[PDB]
Amino acid sequence: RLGLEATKEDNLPDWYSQVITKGEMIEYYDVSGCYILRHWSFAIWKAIRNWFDAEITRLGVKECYFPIFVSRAALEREKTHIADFAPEVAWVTKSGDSELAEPIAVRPTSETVMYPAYAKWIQSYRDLPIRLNQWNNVVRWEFKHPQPFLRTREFLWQEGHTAFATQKEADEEVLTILDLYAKVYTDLLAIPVVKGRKTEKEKFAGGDYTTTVEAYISASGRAIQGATSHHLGQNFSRMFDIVYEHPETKEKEYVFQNSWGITTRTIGVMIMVHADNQGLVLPPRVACIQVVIVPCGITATTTDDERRRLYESCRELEQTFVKAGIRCEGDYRDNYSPGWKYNHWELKGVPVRIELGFKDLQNDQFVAVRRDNGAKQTIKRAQATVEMPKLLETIHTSMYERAERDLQSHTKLTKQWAEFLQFLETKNIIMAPFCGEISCEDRIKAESAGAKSLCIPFEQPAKIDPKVDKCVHPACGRVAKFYTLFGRSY
């Protein structure tokens, strides 16, 4: 029965709403900007969270929890960014019917609370480094048009905050966290990305520099930051008097800080990239169910003893899949036809469906069907334990390389501004030589109406030969500092 009524290419938003609802991944909510994560998508987040947490604790980071409320003073004292952020802050100002003396803010991030804590907690050189992480929820009252995973007012993330004695420690951590974020996207979500440094405009305002992983959703034609990992350097230490006495040098020494974060926006990217016109398509490594066994060949008058015999062999296959470490469940609901179940689990996006009927068990075998391809492969029951991991391996690769192919089909390089704007009009992203200065990024953005910097990619396409190369914008005559990636932004 249930099915997608729209298509990715013609009506992307209604397609997206149909895939997150009929994929049982989201329920809408009477508070705007906020969405119910039903269990089918929360398991995606749970896999991402668990994987990344295991990584950063193996690294020596530790898990903590600061309160959801922040003082007006914690917030505004020594402002990180008066910026244009203060409007986006959710303010509690009444208990029941009693208004409170000073109002308290729901956290948008925890710098202004965790940095005073670090100032207390570091009274000597011996107390360093501090590597603390929280898995928490934040609220940003963002005046834009909201969407389930991509622009939400409350969302889950993890924020890691770190303080070291040396800048070398801090630099290397920034890159180790970025490698793990990159792994979240490629190895778990089968999504390709570009590692880079934000330009001076797009960097976190308070940081020394800001690294990032950036991805592209081509169906929409827009690019999106997938995760970031900042090097604050000494800015916040000097702000918050996070100091120790140098063991040799008698003089006060400020610590070197990093912060890094990744949000549930990841899941939205996963949809936009991998979900097709029949519904969701889950990367095998985050799917709550990797393999679903639908017992087939049950007619309106299949008998309870026949039904039970088949159900029982299905549970035995499901069990030897669990014991092989792969996440398999069987669907034994009696008020649903085999075909109804095929369509159900297709909408839900399970990498593999197993059709096992009476004719299959009589030949001691089964059929496996890929959610991405529709490709069917008959496996002898014996080879199950060895064939099914290969398959799930294969499925990931196909999902990934397909996605990367699309990304490379939507990355065009030019040194000429006209070819830049042609490429941008044709719905893709452009590596071009950029002076790096903020004014020129502004002129570029205005004059593509718009196109923002994405990152200065780590893998540069070529080294700028200064005898020739000038920044792609004709109004600045600055020689090109590097290749930068520009595109229309989310």
Site for ligand HFG in 246-275 (CB under 6 A): 259-261
Residue 440 marked in a binding site: yes
CB-wise, 86 or 324, nearer to ligand HFG? Answer: 86
Interaction between residue 60 and its own copies (CB under 8 A):
no
Residue of the chain from 140, 195, 344, 488 that contacts ligand HFG (CB under 6 A): 140
Quick note: the x/- pattern for its own copies over 76-115, rule CB under 8 A, is: ----------xxxxxxxxxxxxx----xx-x------x--
Residue 453 token pair: 């910097």
Interaction between residue 456 and Zn ion (CB under 5 A):
no
Residue 373 and residue 398 in contact, taking contact as beta carbons nearer than 8 Å? yes
Distance CA 455, CA 214 (A): 7
CB-wise, 10 or 334, nearer to its own copies? Answer: 334
CB-wise, 147 or 377, nearer to its own copies? Answer: 147
Distance CA 289, CA 328 (A): 6
Distance CA 441, CA 427 (A): 20
Binding site partner of 228, from Zn ion, its own copies, ligand HFG, none, Cβ cut-off 5-8 A by kind:
ligand HFG
Binding site partner of 204, from ligand HFG, its own copies, Zn ion, none, Cβ cut-off 5-8 A by kind:
ligand HFG
Binding site partner of 260, from Zn ion, ligand HFG, Cl ion, none, Cβ cut-off 5-8 A by kind:
ligand HFG
Count of residues engaged in binding Cl ion, rule: CB under 5 A? 4
Distance CA 94, CA 360 (A): 65
Distance CA 117, CA 263 (A): 24
Binding site partner of 348, from ligand HFG, its own copies, Cl ion, none, Cβ cut-off 5-8 A by kind:
none
Cα radius of gyration rounded to whole Å, the chain: 26
Binding site partner of 120, from its own copies, ligand HFG, Cl ion, none, Cβ cut-off 5-8 A by kind:
its own copies
Cα–Cα separations (whole angstroms), residue 142 to 64, 67, 88, 158, 475: 27, 21, 6, 19, 33
Residue partners of 184: CB distance under 8 A and separation at least 6: 48, 51, 52, 227, 262, 266
Beta bridge partners of 133: 63, 160
Q: Pairing state of beta strands 26-27 and 36-37?
A: antiparallel
Residue 84 token pair: 């244009």
Residue 328 marked in a binding site: no
CB-wise, 209 or 336, nearer to its own copies? Answer: 336
Residue 435 marked in a binding site: yes
Distance CA 403, CA 216 (A): 10
Residue 476 marked in a binding site: yes
Residue of the chain from 16, 35, 52, 155 that contacts Cl ion (CB under 5 A): 155
Interaction between residue 89 and ligand HFG (CB under 6 A):
yes
Q: How far is the CB of 41 from its own copies (least distance, A)?
A: 9
**Residue 360 CB neighbours (<10 A):** 21
186-212 exposure pattern, b = at least 16 Cβ within 10 A, e = fewer: bebbbbbbbbbbbbebbbbebbbbbbb
Sole window of 99-107, 174-182, 368-376, 469-477 interacting with Zn ion (rule: CB under 5 A)? 469-477
The residues binding its own copies (CB under 8 A) are: 27, 29-31, 34-39, 42-43, 46, 62-71, 73-74, 86-98, 103-104, 106, 113, 117, 120-121, 125-126, 132, 137, 139, 141, 154, 156, 333, 335-336
The residues binding ligand HFG (CB under 6 A) are: 85, 88-89, 108-109, 111, 140, 159, 204, 228, 230, 259-261
Binding-site residues for Zn(2+), in ranges, read 435, 440, 471, 476
